[PDB]
Amino acid sequence: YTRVVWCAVGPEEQKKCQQWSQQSGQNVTCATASTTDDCIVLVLKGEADALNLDGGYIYTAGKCGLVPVLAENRKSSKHSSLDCVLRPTEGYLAVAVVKKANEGLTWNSLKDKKSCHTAVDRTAGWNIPMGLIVNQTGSCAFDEFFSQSCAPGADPKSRLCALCAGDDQGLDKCVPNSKEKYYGYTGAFRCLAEDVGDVAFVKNDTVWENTNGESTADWAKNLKREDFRLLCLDGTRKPVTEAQSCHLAVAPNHAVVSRSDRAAHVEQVLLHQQALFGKNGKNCPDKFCLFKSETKNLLFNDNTECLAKLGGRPTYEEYLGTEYVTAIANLKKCS
Amino acid sequence: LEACAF
Ligand SMILES: *[C@@H]1O[C@H](CO)[C@@H](O[C@@H]2O[C@H](CO)[C@@H](O)[C@H](O)[C@H]2NC(C)=O)[C@H](O)[C@H]1NC(C)=O
Ligand SMILES: *[C@@H]1O[C@H](CO)[C@@H](O[C@@H]2O[C@H](CO)[C@@H](O)[C@H](O)[C@H]2NC(C)=O)[C@H](O)[C@H]1NC(C)=O
Ligand SMILES: *[C@@H]1O[C@H](CO)[C@@H](O)[C@H](O)[C@H]1NC(C)=O
Ligand SMILES: NCCCCCC(=O)O
Ligand SMILES: [Fe+3]
Ligand SMILES: [Zn+2]
Ligand SMILES: [Zn+2]
Helix, strand or coil: CCCEEEEEEHHHHHHHHHHHHHHCCCCEEEEEECCHHHHHHHHHHCCCCEEEECHHHHHHHHHCCCEEEEEEEECCCCCCCCCHHHCCCCCEEEEEEEECCCCCCCHHHCCCCEEEECCCCCHHHHHHHHHHHHHHHCCCCHHHCCCEEECCCCCCCCHHHCCCCCCCCCCCCCCCCCCCCCCHHHHHHHHHHCCCCCEEEEEHHHHHHCCCCCCCCCCCCCCCHHHEEEECCCCCEEEHHHHHHCCCEEECCCEEEECHHHHHHHHHHHHHHHHHHCCCCCCCCCCCCCCCCCCCCCCCCCCEEEEEECCCCCCHHHHHCHHHHHHHHHHHCCC | CCCCCC
């Protein structure tokens, strides 16, 4: 058999991948790149085999020929007798979150406010909110809608990166990897928690997972869910308990992609690797847990229960859904 | 309906 070469985005992912590789007896090995688009290019060149991707990045990968292999499955809201690997995925809820104390703010008064996004080109952080804003404003000038933002991946001198903070030294401002303080779900929620931004575009799970003591991290350890509100598209504000009736969209779960001729081997290796290091895996927590990273969602989201098999050997457009693909392609007309 | 970005 062949080794599977994973692609880690940035140095924190690379460290976790190197621990996985050592524990896997090198059944998995690691390549690393600075951004997710650069990892996609390593896999297209055949210099890496696979990585797990947000749906906006699956669109970029899929336009280049890479295919979905397995999907993240988090705990289901409804009981199921099916094994995690065979249980159907339920998308996650993209939401817009604000502070309750910011009393005037609704979906309809976001213009000229400060925003926090997971990264350009990601589903909840960017494609869903900016796609809705372009459409509602009738304007492609989404780079001028908010007064300042942190949108990792955007031009670092532009207003879309003005709120980004870089790393411990202030280097790498706005890079779309975990070195940027405000990257990703947890970084964009921290941008809101710290009142750097007025609004964060994340998913429902992020707000729950980083409030009320669910996270012990210093910036989160003291946050209370009741201090946050969701912005609904009808211009109302709701408690974060009401995400099923106050979301911007339902997103397809993050999933692993690879080149088509390595998909079967990547699939078999991952099913074995999660049997060892997955949630309740043979070797987790004693040796290594593939789906933990101290809340930092490195390689996989920390709320992943397993990687699940896909139904219907789907193409990337079947996996993302036609409606979402068309929304992305509509927004990408602006660029 | 476009192609690969890279
Ligand atoms: C919003 O996200 C949270 C966190 O994932 C979900 O709350 C979890 O729901 C699971 C499955 O029901 C429970 O067993 C977990 O205990 C809950 N976690 C926490 C921290 O409370 C919540 O269901 C999601 N809301 C919607 C509408 O999907
Ligand atoms: C932004 O608006 C565009 C244009 O209306 C939306 O695109 C349409 O989506 C519907 C439903 O999926 C399709 O039947 C149409 O064919 C699409 N129209 C065009 C011209 O492509 C798009 O969904 C909207 N974006 C968001 C994020 O809601
Ligand atoms: C490495 O992979 C081989 C072949 O599938 C298998 O026999 C071995 O158990 C694997 N070990 C680990 C630790 O993943
Ligand atoms: N256009 C369909 C987007 C995918 C929705 C997420 C889901 O149903 O799992
Ligand atoms: Fe996402
Ligand atoms: Zn809905
Ligand atoms: Zn099909």
